[PDB]
């Protein structure tokens, strides 16, 4: 008995035992802990080479277990019914807090308790950056450790006082520290290694904004190209069918195919096959989301419609036609602005983003200043038709309408397919 | 629809960069009324709870701060005793009786 | 590789179908191979040489063998940058010098690698003397210009040659269908 | 039994109709974050 | 089109192969202002980097 | 060993400056705990101007 040592359970009695759910999952001790909670069976660990053990009687559990962990860590534990039998209080932390002067004052007081010296401008800029991290104009980030780290960096770069200038410098240096990838991308674009068109008009080409992997997910344009040729009614998405990934039927090819087939109705099947491809390979496209850029590129390729290369096109679209919101819109917009500034601002560049993302546009100071000067633009579109009429610079109503040109292109391609099938028939 | 600067402006205006602000500390779990209510219920009832939150929310530290101000009756002295040479049982005695 | 759709095959097929539309499904089967397998060809980008050779085989275009063709293409027809352009240019120059330069050997390389060319002194000296030629191409069409020595526009151009090849193969396929039906 | 325990805890050692109503409301509310964020997104127009 | 020699020449011309060169030592992390600033921040703040 | 020693937790006053090739961190940045601990990314540009 004198050689029995107390673990965590034997010093949490009458109190609280706080464990990391990820730790229980990783160490494979969740079964033993569950038995200890239900049956009150605590048993000291033994050594395999010592055969003689001590039969420890069950011990009534008087402790309160408050696990703590990320939602993903519990998604591996809530499947067990005994978990929901034992743990019944869900203390969920909202990842975002309401963005209101009450919460701004609370954040200021909380950082003051941390020992930081905040000026009013510094607290205001920290609040703005919290909103930016939450990526919502109406919600501030509830990750108070992140804001504390940013405040520490601001204090170091500002002496001991978190002036507005100090915290602005801290945010700028935080962006600049992991900026090497985008710096190399801009140097490549300027040097001509990666050629992107940010002026003039082109057919079947668009600047689809994508995200690349990093500690901050950096947005950057990618030249999406669409080529339409007569053939089967199949939409070939080269990016997501590359290699052995083409055995999955995806959810985006079906979306665009349904939109194209239902929207333009003059034949019993789609008379074109459209290859959708990306120049360069850094894009990492999700297979379940069909971007608005793919739809507008396909429509331009069908109709020989010269789209503007000034405007980058981002946003998800469903088979109805309306544009869905996409994540990390701020990163994509800022990335396209960086590329445009590196190649020179013609005063007509811009981004086409869904109106549903209008509530997530928390943009940096530089982009907003460019918009105010009129050197940049931000376009909000509710349906893919609006994006197409913005890009092609013409309306879908009347003679020379966009829908009519698309119908003419489909009719010509169907005429070629008719000629091919007629020749093959005889 | 072209978004103007007014529609895109989201940065609250700044009145000064000096004159440091003094504010009282906020209550624990500020803006987290759900978590605070759940923890109050769990502590009052002695139920087994679990905090669920995205990483870097400082869930671990506010939990400690909220539990420190909590108070319960004095815990008993728990200890192993031999019921036999091979059988050992855990029992709790009143505080300071060990 | 039979159960793989790749990404370089799809790009070449897309370019070939989109650029030449006078029938439906492109009436050719293009078999692309490298003699003397040491290549270890990439699987994520279609080379410009693959497209140019496919077009030459389609249209019966005698390409120049003096000029090596390097660069990656997409389905728009643009020639993209490729890695290690110095190694490829120097390798072709070494092979040309081993067999003896005739003052017409050269390398066709993407425009995007213009800011990427740092060559040994021997290659630069050869270019100085006019014994080695470096051509920079922006689109596969310009590479076909340089190799075939003829333009897409004009009488007996490249477009009509590729059209003639496609039409001949389509006529052969139609004859096969006529035999099958009868 | 667990719901009765929650109701008694919220009612202070007494279980009434109001206490059970509060317990049911709290049981909905402690797992309501996903719906709260979905409703906020719908209101903000992210999900039309 | 064909790249002329002038467009391909990249070597900075050597004006002599003599006069041994004497230059002051460069500051640490020269051309690496990103890394130098990051390390200065990490050292002054005591953040793991 | 039959019986070890129960070593108490120690407050850490050092700071850790990891050094690694970027693909060595590509397999180590998957942890959110890595982001929480190591916050200063001092990244060396592979090419100088």
Distance from CA of B69 to the nearest CA of A (A): 13
CA dihedral A104, A110, A113, A117 (to 10 degrees): -40
E touches which chains (3+ CB pairs under 8 A)?
A, C, F
Please answer yes or no on whether E41 and A153 come within 8 Å at the CB atom. yes
CA distances, A381 to each of A108, A321, A325 (Å) = 37, 11, 10
- Asked if residue B45 lies in contact with residue B38, where contact means CB atoms within 8 angstroms, the answer is no
* Cβ proximity of D30 and A89 under 8 Å: yes
Interface test with B, best of D1, D4, D6, D40 (most B CBs within 10 A): D6
Phi, psi of B75 (to 5 degrees): -65, 150
Q: Measured between alpha carbons, how far is C31 from C48 in angstroms, rounded to an integer?
A: 15
In this complex, which of E1, E8, E11 lies closest to C127 when CB atoms are compared? E8
Count of CB atoms situated within 10 Å of the CB of C28: 16
Q: What would the two tokens of residue A99 be?
A: 């963005």
Residues of chain F contacting B56 with CB distance shorter than 8 Å: 32, 35-36
Interface contact flag, C134 E9, Cβ < 8 Å: no
Quick check: F39 and E39 CB within 8 A?
no
Do A94 and B34 form a contact (C-beta atoms < 8 A)? yes
How far is residue C114's CA from residue E10's CA, in Å, rounded to a whole number? 11
Parallel, antiparallel, or unpaired for β B77-82 and B87-93? antiparallel
- Note whether C104 contacts A: Cβ–Cβ < 8 A: no
Chain D contact partners (≥3 CB pairs within 8 A): A, B
Q: Is A1 helix (H, G, I), strand (E, B) or coil?
A: coil
State whether A152 and E45 contact (CB < 8 Å): yes
Contact state of A92 with D31 under an 8 Å Cβ cutoff: yes
User: Using CA of residue C66, residue C70, residue C75, residue C78, what is the dihedral sign?
Assistant: negative
Torsions phi, psi for A366 (to 5 deg): -65, -45
**Quick check: A217 and A327 in contact, CB under 8 A?**
no
Q: What angle do CA B62, B68, B73 make, to 5 degrees?
A: 145
Q: Is A212 on the interface with C (CB under 8 A)?
A: no
The residue among A40, A41, A50, A91 with the most chain B CBs within 10 A of its CB, best to mutate, is A91
Q: Verify whether the Cβ–Cβ distance A155 to E34 is below 8 Å.
A: no
Residues 3-42 of F with CB under 8 A from B: 32-33, 35-36
Instruction: Tell how far CA F41 is from the center of its chain.
Output: 11
Tell me how many degrees the CA angle A194-A360-A130 measures, rounded to the nearest 5.
100
CB spacing of E1 vs C135 below 8 angstroms: yes
Residue B66: CB atoms within 10 Å: 17
- C57 Cβ contact list (under 8 Å, min separation 6): C30
Residues C78, C72: Cα–Cα separation, whole Å: 8
Nominal resolution (angstroms): 3.4
D46 inside 8 A of chain A by CB: yes
Please compute, for residue D11, the number of CA atoms within 13 A of its CA located in the half-sphere on the CB side. 18
**In a 3-state reduction of DSSP, which class is residue A273?**
strand
Residue from B23, B74, B84 whose CB has the most chain A CBs within 10 Å, to mutate: B23
What is the Cα–Cα distance from A395 to A401, expressed in whole angstroms? 6
Dihedral (Cα; B82, B84, B88, B93), 10-degree rounding: -40
Across the interface, do B38 and D30 touch by the CB < 8 Å criterion? Answer: yes
Nearest CB to A241: which of C5, C174, C181?
C5
F15 interaction partners in chain E (CB closer than 8 Å): 42, 46-49
A217 touches chain B (CB under 8 A): no
CA distance A292 to A226: 13
- Chains B and D form CB pairs within 8 A to the count of 19
Residues C2/C6/C12/C17 CA torsion (nearest 10 deg): 70
H/E element holding B29? none
C60 conformational bin, left if phi > 0, alpha if psi -120 to 50, beta if neither: left
Quick check: helix, strand or coil at residue A367? helix
Question: Does A205 touch chain C if contact means CB atoms closer than 8 Å?
Answer: yes
Q: Please, are residues A408 and A272 in contact by the beta-carbon 8 Å criterion?
A: no
Token digits for A55? Answer: 């039969």
- Is A88 part of the contact surface with chain D (CB cutoff 8 Å)? yes
Angle at C164 between CA C161 and CA C166, to 5 degrees: 110
Q: What angle do CA D43, D45, D46 make, to 5 degrees?
A: 115
Residues of E in contact with C124 (CB under 8 A): 5, 8-9, 11
Interface membership of A358 toward F (CB under 8 Å): no
- Return all residues near E28 (Cβ < 8 A) that are at least 6 apart: E36
3-class state of residue C130 by DSSP: coil
Q: How was this structure determined?
A: cryo-EM
Do A84 and B27 contact (CB within 8 A), yes or no? Answer: no
Q: Is B31 on the interface with D (CB under 8 A)?
A: no
Taking the C-alpha atoms of residue A22 and residue A35, their distance in angstroms, rounded to an integer, is: 18
Interface partners of chain F (CB pairs < 8 Å, 3 or more) are: A, B, E
User: Distance (Å, rounded) from C-alpha C73 to C-alpha C141?
Assistant: 11
Neighbours of chain C (3+ CB pairs under 8 A): A, E
Please tell me the distance from the alpha carbon of residue A420 to that of residue A416, in angstroms, as a whole number.
6
Closest CA to E3 of A62, C67, A203: C67
**Separation between Cα atoms, residue F48 and residue B82, nearest integer Å:** 73
Give CA–CA dist A22/B51, Å, rounded: 12
Residue B38 contacts D where some CB pair is shorter than 8 Å? yes
Q: How far is CA C174 from the centre of its chain?
A: 28
């Amino acid at each position: 008995v004198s050689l029995i040592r107390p673990g965590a359970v034997h010093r949490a009695q009458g109190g609280y035992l706080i464990l990391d759910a990820l730790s229980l999952k990783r160490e494979g001790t969740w079964e033993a802990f569950k038995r200890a909670l239900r049956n009150g069976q605590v048993e000291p660990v033994t050594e395999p080479q010592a055969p003689a053990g001590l039969e420890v009687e069950p011990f009534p559990i008087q402790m309160q277990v408050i696990l703590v962990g990320t939602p993903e860590a519990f998604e591996g534990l809530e499947e067990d019914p005994a978990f929901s039998e034992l743990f019944r209080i869900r203390a969920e932390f909202s990842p975002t807090l309401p963005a209101s002067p009450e919460n701004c004052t609370a954040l200021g007081g909380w950082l003051l308790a941390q020992g930081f010296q905040l000026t009013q401008g510094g607290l205001t800029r920290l609040y703005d950056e919290a909103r930016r991290m939450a990526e919502q104009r109406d919600r501030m980030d509830a990750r108070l450790v992140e804001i504390r780290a940013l405040a520490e960096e601001a204090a170091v770069l500002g002496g001991g006082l978190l002036t507005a200038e100090s915290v602005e410098q801290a945010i700028a240096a935080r962006e600049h520290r992991s900026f090497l990838s985008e710096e190399e991308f801009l140097r490549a674009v300027q040097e001509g290694v990666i050629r992107l068109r940010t002026t003039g008009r082109a057919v079947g080409e668009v600047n689809s904004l994508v995200v690349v992997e990093a500690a901050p997910y950096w947005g950057r344009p990618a030249r999406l190209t669409a080529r339409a040729a007569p053939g089967r009614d199949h939409l070939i998405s080269i990016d997501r069918e590359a290699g052995l990934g083409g055995q999955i039927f995806h959810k985006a090819v079906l979306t665009l195919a349904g939109y194209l087939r239902s929207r333009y109705i003059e034949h019993g099947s789609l008379p074109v096959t459209i290859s959708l491809a990306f120049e360069q390979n850094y894009v990492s496209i999700e297979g379940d989301a069909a971007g608005l850029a793919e739809l507008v590129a396909a429509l331009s390729a069908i109709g020989n419609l010269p789209l503007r290369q000034d405007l980058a096109v981002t946003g998800a679209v469903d088979q109805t036609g309306k544009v869905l919101a996409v994540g990390a819109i701020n990163a994509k917009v800022e990335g396209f602005f960086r590329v445009c500034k590196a190649l020179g601002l013609s005063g007509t560049q811009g981004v086409i983003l869904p109106e549903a993302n209008l509530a997530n546009l928390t943009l940096r100071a530089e982009v907003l200043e460019a918009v105010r000067a009129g050197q940049f633009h931000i376009y909000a579109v509710e349906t893919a038709e609006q994006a197409l009429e913005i890009l092609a610079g013409a309306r879908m109503e009347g003679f020379r309408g966009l829908q009519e040109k698309i119908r003419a292109g489909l009719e010509a391609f169907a005429r070629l397919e008719e000629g091919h099938d007629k020749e093959d028939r005889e | 629809m072209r978004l103007s600067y007014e529609a895109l402006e989201w940065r609250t205006p700044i009145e000064n960069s000096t004159e440091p602000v003094s504010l009282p500390p906020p209550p624990p779990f500020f803006g987290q009324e759900r978590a605070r209510e759940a923890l109050e219920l769990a502590i009052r009832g002695g139920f087994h709870a679990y905090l669920v939150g995205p990483p870097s929310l400082g869930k671990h530290e506010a939990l400690l701060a909220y539990l420190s101000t909590q108070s319960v009756e004095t815990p008993p002295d728990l200890l192993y005793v031999p019921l036999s040479e091979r059988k050992v049982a855990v029992l709790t005695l009143p505080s300071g009786q060990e």
